[PDB]
Copies of this chain bind each other. A is one copy, B any other.
């Protein structure tokens, strides 16, 4: 039931297409990796010809060439690849009126929950028609804003895909989540946390995940979901201390469902990842004081910010940061 129907048609003049970098292409900077490159490149051409046949002026760019100037030149952004390319596309759109549309250029292998339905990959003119008639819904997805302050801070971001101070609004917003933790996988993180302006709790864990409704289907879900076997063990323990397989798969699914919420809900699902002796809650604001030696904040898996002892971060949710996305019929 999400979104709202378009008031009129969507008939843009200028569109930037940002295209995924294929596994084959990553080497330039065995048979099947070339195939998946042809499939993708073929679908990007299909997208570009469709735009051009309608009369939309089109710029094709890769990650290295997708900058703020092209976003401002464009009336709309089209991410051609997968959910990651949606994440790339959105990282440089800060205007809540500029639409961002994702097309899964490889349906049979990288099914992407942030892109149009797979039918519109091979039938993309049909999507452009529906846009023209106004037969679609706008969906404004909430995103997370990040402020950084403290001593020895560094607000300059690092693109992971290419290898005393007042509060500072960081240059990206999180569509999926903000991950806060030590740069290195195997080293535990130490920080003080304040949820909704509450008291500071000292915490030692393997990181923090702060996600949106959009992001709740992503890392947060795998951080927090329970397996059908665990539910079965819990019940057997309860049945033994105090059961069909369809009845067990249903409690699991109902439980795992409660981990998911609407991408329109302006709330943060805050998960403490593997705490060491509240692990998860909803919130409007979270503030983290870093107490670690070599930590980072990673936004949507791609933009990293240094986050070392004496840095303070505050994440919250602002209407200005909504991402204008679309919902198509089928």
Point out residues on A near B: beta carbons under 8 Å.
160, 179, 181-187, 205-207, 219, 222-223, 226-227, 229-231, 233-235, 237-238, 241-242, 247, 250-251, 254-255, 258, 274-277, 279, 296, 298, 301, 304
Whether A234 pairs with B251 at a CB distance below 8 angstroms is: yes
Known A160-B184, A222-B275, A275-B222: A241·B251 in contact at CB below 8 Å: yes
Contact indicator B184/A182 (Cβ below 8 Å): no
The copy count of this chain in the complex is: 2
Residues of B within 8 A of A226 (CB): 226, 230, 234
Which chain B residue shows the least CB distance to A161?
B187
B258 touching A227 by the CB < 8 A rule?
no
Q: Which residues of B contact A222 (CB under 8 A)?
A: 205-206, 274-277
Q: Which secondary structure characterizes the binding site on chain A? A: mixed
B241 with A187: CB separation less than 8 A: no
Name the B residues within 8 Å of A242 (CB-CB). Answer: 247
* Assembled-state Cα–Cα distance A70/B238 (Å): 53
Which residues of B lie under 8 Å from residue A186 when comparing CB positions? 160, 179, 181, 296, 298, 301, 304
Instruction: Please tell me if the beta carbons of B185 and A160 are within 8 angstroms of each other in the complex.
Output: no
In the complex, residue of chain B having the shortest beta-carbon distance to the beta carbon of A233:
B255
Residues in B neighbouring A182, C-beta threshold 8 A: 185
